[PDB]
Design a protein around this ligand. Sequence first.
Ligand SMILES: Nc1ncnc2c1ncn2[C@@H]1O[C@H](COP(=O)(O)OP(=O)(O)OP(=O)(O)O)[C@@H](O)[C@H]1O
Ligand SMILES: Nc1ncnc2c1ncn2[C@@H]1O[C@H](COP(=O)(O)OP(=O)(O)O)[C@@H](O)[C@H]1O
Ligand SMILES: Nc1ncnc2c1ncn2[C@@H]1O[C@H](COP(=O)(O)OP(=O)(O)O)[C@@H](O)[C@H]1O
Ligand SMILES: [Mg+2]
Lengths: 509, 232, 116, 43, 43
Amino acid sequence: LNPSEISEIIKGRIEKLDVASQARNEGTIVSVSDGIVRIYGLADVMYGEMIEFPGGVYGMALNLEQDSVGAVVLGEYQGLAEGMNAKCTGRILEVPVGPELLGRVVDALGNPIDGKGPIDAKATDAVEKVAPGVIWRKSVDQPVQTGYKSVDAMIPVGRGQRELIIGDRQIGKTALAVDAIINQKDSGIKCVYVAIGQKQSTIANVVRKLEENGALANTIVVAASASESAALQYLAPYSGCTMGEYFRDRGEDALIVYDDLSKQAVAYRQISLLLRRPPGREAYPGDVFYLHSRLLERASRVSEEYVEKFTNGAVTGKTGSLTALPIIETQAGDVSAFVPTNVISITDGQIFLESAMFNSGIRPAVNAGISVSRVGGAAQTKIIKKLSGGIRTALAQYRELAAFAQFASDLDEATRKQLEHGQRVTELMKQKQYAPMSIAEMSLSLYAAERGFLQDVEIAKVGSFEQALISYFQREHAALLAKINEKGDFNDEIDAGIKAGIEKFKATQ
Amino acid sequence: EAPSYADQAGGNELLETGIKVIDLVCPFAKGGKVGLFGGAGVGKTVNMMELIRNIAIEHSGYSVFAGVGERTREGNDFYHEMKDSNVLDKVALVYGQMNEPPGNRLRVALTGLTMAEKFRDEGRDVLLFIDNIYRYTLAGTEVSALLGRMPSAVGYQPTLAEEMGVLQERITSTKKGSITSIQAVYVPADDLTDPSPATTFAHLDATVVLSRDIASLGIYPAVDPLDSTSRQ
Amino acid sequence: EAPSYADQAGGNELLETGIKVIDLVCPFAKGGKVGLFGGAGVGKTVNMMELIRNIAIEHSGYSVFAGVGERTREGNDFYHEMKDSNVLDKVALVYGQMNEPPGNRLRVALTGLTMA
Amino acid sequence: GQQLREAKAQAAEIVEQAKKRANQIVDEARDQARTEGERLKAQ
Amino acid sequence: GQQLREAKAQAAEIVEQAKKRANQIVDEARDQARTEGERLKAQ
Ligand SMILES: Nc1ncnc2c1ncn2[C@@H]1O[C@H](COP(=O)(O)OP(=O)(O)OP(=O)(O)O)[C@@H](O)[C@H]1O
Ligand SMILES: Nc1ncnc2c1ncn2[C@@H]1O[C@H](COP(=O)(O)OP(=O)(O)O)[C@@H](O)[C@H]1O
Ligand SMILES: Nc1ncnc2c1ncn2[C@@H]1O[C@H](COP(=O)(O)OP(=O)(O)O)[C@@H](O)[C@H]1O
Ligand SMILES: [Mg+2]
């Protein structure tokens, strides 16, 4: 297992060492307080430049005054002391980018924390950027499938869309975003998951659930846990966004989750209040809308001319995109609070998760009254857009009539049948964790709801009915499901084959 | 500077919008000023796009559209919509969106207003559309403590009403020509007594207030009829 | 520092307490955190001594108490109640009392966590 | 009597479709068991 | 009517019995692959 000659690497490192003197621009630490260091000197430092301290500690220059430089420490500050040396690096704040980060867990500066060796990235890129302009965009029409029936039927997400996931604590926000990540393992869309302010055992459970479902090799994980510095918690979404923008700028497609943007705003509030900046609503800084809007604008779809301009002619005739799913935690259903209303004013729709529907066992818990997608059916495939026109109206007729089931035997026929269809569509949209459905299976369930094949089936046997129907179409009509799973086409042949299979299921099974 | 008191033009000629609540309870005038107040995701942009589409029917002059601190995707959609339907050659577009540093967002509405002032001083009747005028004001928040100023109430700049007045008093019709203006106005955390909309209210002829409760009932265009007034 | 990402144990292994309502209705995780609610006089201290006795005798572990803002009367009472229930030698006691300046009351949980 | 023998034949056909569904889910579980054992080996 | 209700109630039993065979096959394959994994890592 371990021969002795393979440890001769040290000799080769000695043969690639430059021992010539190089000129540096240097300074001295004057004061250290709460992650903020004042430095004398450093007369050639740039705004946003990494500053090297002893022990491998870096900082970023924020306040270039005439006689001092204020820097924010990008790590633990507690080993820094007055009198220690500071050096310019020549580098505005960078992260490594590339396909070599796929499968790896890193921190906010790209250093690996999973114990699987060094990352051999061939390129770095800047953390702070301005998003590309008005003329370089293209309108969103390709689908991103989350694998959930309620999300892919009602609130569809496209390539380049920003779609917020918002709701109270412990009602499934990480679950919806992680299952949207796991459904990209055979679709060509690469994935970035940024955890901000979470517990480390939660992050390790998330990466173990990514490896157990076969999607870790498609996903970069960037982690800044709850006992890190607030600088790394503030800077980790932009670092993961640069990691997704590598695949955006070369005509490929990526998808990023920010699993709490609400904890990033708390960390930026901490940094701004320690700099004695004057606050506004809820003690947040005045530029807090700008904190989210500089990030989420970077998620976009860019045209073929932008991709041809970026790669200098290497990639021709391809668009690239980056889809974002930010996540916001609310307090007791208050969606009119300052940070939630700032992020709604930025995204292209949102998915509201309701605590009462979660506590009644309606487990994907999507409030269909107020969830919306601004792109809509321009992103959707044809069979899914055709069969989901009657879902939202069946859930709408159920909203008020769901409290009438205790006296519904003394009601008229249209109100009774609308309430029966509402209970059937509500029982159809329940779905377990870690069970994705394809285009053909959600089309089978949506056709079973929409065309009236749920009418003689009771409520407690709806979803078991759905599972049996899926199994029957997997063993009798597998070429039909492979026809639907190509690009989601719909015509009269597919219509007739689905309705003949459902009638043979309802007659013989 | 603003045009003088002797150069002001009066007029109350009605502008029909085709929308029932707007024509009923807060009617518009040609050469007048319109605010569309509302919180996050209640409709402001959808209403402005409908007001652009229906005010374009009986208007034959030019238009200036200024995007101040809003979505870059909305700018690309509106440009490709006007280019596809061949009305792009009447409209001048200025954009300083949410992705920009705050000097660009602080000064882009002055550029769009300068182009509308040149069209007004050639003796024409022009339309001026500004999506979020609140985003000029918030850019003046972001640089205010860096300019050495002590904060006013709820962290705003102390020069709030003067920056609003120096911008809003150039938008008017004069005796040379007329400007009809539609401006979307953001309300922070759905609070109408926040100082930025509360200073914005007296600069306008017609005020359309949108409501999250009326839109949560399913009613669009979501106008509160007891909170929307106009002098017409 | 906190333990690192590679030092996490993994899984969702339960800690058996031996109490039936706790192990049925609201089960505890190893490495987990338990909020405890309620007023006074409903049996909080007796539940704490029973958890100390059960983790010492049946699982061969120890306990550390850290009293953040400890009232002096109740700390003397809790010390004599743990002498009379034979569970004093199973737990290390750290008090940061109420009449102390607030850095003592800030760092007393870090002291008890270091012994744990 | 004639509708009783038709009821007995429909009972036997319902039983045979249950055994066909049973053989299907046992076969899919064998395929799932094979690919999950290969994933734990590779890990 | 008794015979048709008895046939549907037996069909649900056949589907649930094969589901328990499905869960046993997949969980024993996961456990056997894990034990051979700890054997190779200790070796
Ligand atoms: N579709 C589902 N069916 C059943 N249980 C589910 C489903 N989705 C989520 N859950 C359960 O709901 C619980 C809460 O989910 P989750 O941890 O994703 O919530 P969250 O809102 O992201 O919470 P956190 O505050 O930790 O970020 C979990 O224990 C999870 O197993
Ligand atoms: N007239 C309308 N009809 C239907 N839906 C509407 C209407 N106006 C607004 N909405 C819904 O509200 C969303 C937000 O509208 P938008 O104009 O973007 O809001 P705002 O400008 O206030 O942020 C729309 O994308 C749509 O889902
Ligand atoms: N397990 C128990 N069995 C019987 N009585 C109990 C039990 N736990 C508590 N009690 C009763 O409740 C009272 C309050 O208990 P205690 O733990 O001392 O509360 P506190 O510490 O808040 O004063 C005790 O005096 C005792 O009589
Ligand atoms: Mg808008």
